[PDB]
Amino acid sequence: RLVEDGKYGAQDDVNGQWNGMVRELIDHKADLAVAPLAITYVREKVID
């Protein structure tokens, strides 16, 4: 399944949001991301 928001994770500074891949990996709406997923240190805090 392609993600619906069409974004690469990439922290959303509105209040702390996570508009991309990692939104699917917080909300348990998708449990894998074999995708462009260069490990970012701030992503390590909220996903693994």
Curated annotation (Swiss-Prot):
Name of the protein: Glutamate receptor ionotropic, kainate 2
Subcellular locations according to the entry: Cell membrane; Postsynaptic cell membrane
Tissue-by-tissue expression: Highest expression is found in the olfactory lobe, piriform cortex, dentate gyrus, hippocampus, granular cell layer of the cerebellum, and in caudate-putamen.
Organism: Rattus norvegicus (Rat)
PTM characteristics: Sumoylation mediates kainate receptor-mediated endocytosis and regulates synaptic transmission. Sumoylation is enhanced by PIAS3 and desumoylated by SENP1. Ubiquitinated. Ubiquitination regulates the GRIK2 levels at the synapse by leading kainate receptor degradation through proteasome.
UniProt-annotated binding residues for L-glutamate: P36, A38, R43
Span within the parent record: 481 to 528 of 908
Binding partners and assembly: Homotetramer and heterotetramer with GRIK5. Tetramers may be formed by the dimerization of dimers. Assembles into a kainate-gated homomeric channel that does not bind AMPA. Can form functional heteromeric receptors with GRIK4 and GRIK5. Can form functional heteromeric receptors with GRIK3. Interacts with DLG4. Interacts with NETO2. Interacts (via C-terminus) with KLHL17 (via kelch repeats); the interaction targets GRIK2 for degradation via ubiquitin-proteasome pathway.
Family membership noted in the UniProt record: Belongs to the glutamate-gated ion channel (TC 1.A.10.1) family. GRIK2 subfamily.
Known role: Ionotropic glutamate receptor that functions as a cation-permeable ligand-gated ion channel, gated by L-glutamate and the glutamatergic agonist kainic acid. L-glutamate acts as an excitatory neurotransmitter at many synapses in the central nervous system. Binding of the excitatory neurotransmitter L-glutamate induces a conformation change, leading to the opening of the cation channel, and thereby converts the chemical signal to an electrical impulse. The receptor then desensitizes rapidly and enters a transient inactive state, characterized by the presence of bound agonist. Independent of its ionotropic glutamate receptor activity, acts as a thermoreceptor conferring sensitivity to cold temperatures. Functions in dorsal root ganglion neurons.
Other notes: The postsynaptic actions of Glu are mediated by a variety of receptors that are named according to their selective agonists. This receptor binds domoate > kainate > quisqualate > glutamate. It does not bind AMPA without coexpression with GRIK5.
Lineage: Eukaryota, Metazoa, Chordata, Craniata, Vertebrata
